[PDB]
């Protein structure tokens, strides 16, 4: 309803994103939407628009995580370098917790993911885990085991540190220090 040409912009980005990238959108907006959206992910953005929570800046952030600087130029005419300085302020439409996990996974390469699994075996004890699963999948995997919680990570920093990824560890610290969001019912 409300027609608006904003629907067209939303539709176009869905087609451009790969099935792998499309998963990230659900993950990032997972907190915002309890998967209330029908099976089609196209409707995911549609329901967000209705809530009025869909900001263009958010779309820029969403496209950036999936490493789609190319689409930024075509859809929002946003410079790739502009995103780097813009995100410097580290603004988040939704809790940084969900974005933090997606962003970190993006930084890690395929080899890094495999190495991370071995570290997880010691704590996980060899649970339902495989190299096939992506970094994003690993994040939700830990949720079942309740080894990682929004207000308590600890384990995440240790494993990443082993991979000699100080930058990732630093980003996590920002999140922990960003717990004073003063958000409550």
């Amino acid at each position: 309803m409300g027609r608006s040409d904003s629907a067209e912009v939303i539709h176009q980005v869905e087609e451009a994103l790969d099935t792998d990238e499309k998963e990230m959108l659900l993950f990032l907006c997972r907190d915002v939407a309890i998967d209330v959206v029908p099976p089609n992910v196209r409707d995911l953005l549609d329901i967000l628009r209705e809530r009025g929570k869909l900001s263009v800046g958010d779309l820029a952030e969403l496209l950036y995580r999936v490493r789609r600087f190319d689409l930024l130029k075509r859809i929002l005419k946003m410079d790739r370098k502009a995103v780097e300085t813009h995100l410097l302020r580290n603004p988040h439409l939704v809790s940084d917790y969900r974005v933090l996990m997606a962003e970190i996974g993006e930084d890690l390469d395929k080899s890094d993911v495999s190495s991370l699994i071995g570290l997880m075996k010691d704590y996980m004890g060899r649970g339902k885990i495989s190299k096939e699963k992506s970094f994003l999948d690993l994040v939700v995997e830990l949720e079942k085991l309740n080894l990682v919680a929004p207000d308590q990570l600890d384990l995440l920093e240790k494993c990443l540190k082993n991979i000699h990824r100080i930058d990732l560890k630093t980003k996590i610290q920002k999140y922990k220090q960003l717990e004073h969001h003063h958000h409550h019912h």
């Binding site: 904003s6 912009v9 263009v56 820029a60 929002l76 005419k77 946003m78 502009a82 813009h86």
Partner: peptide, 8 residues
């Protein structure tokens, strides 16, 4: 940004 986001 925010100035390069308004693009919609």
């Amino acid at each position: 940004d925010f100035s390069r986001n308004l693009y919609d």
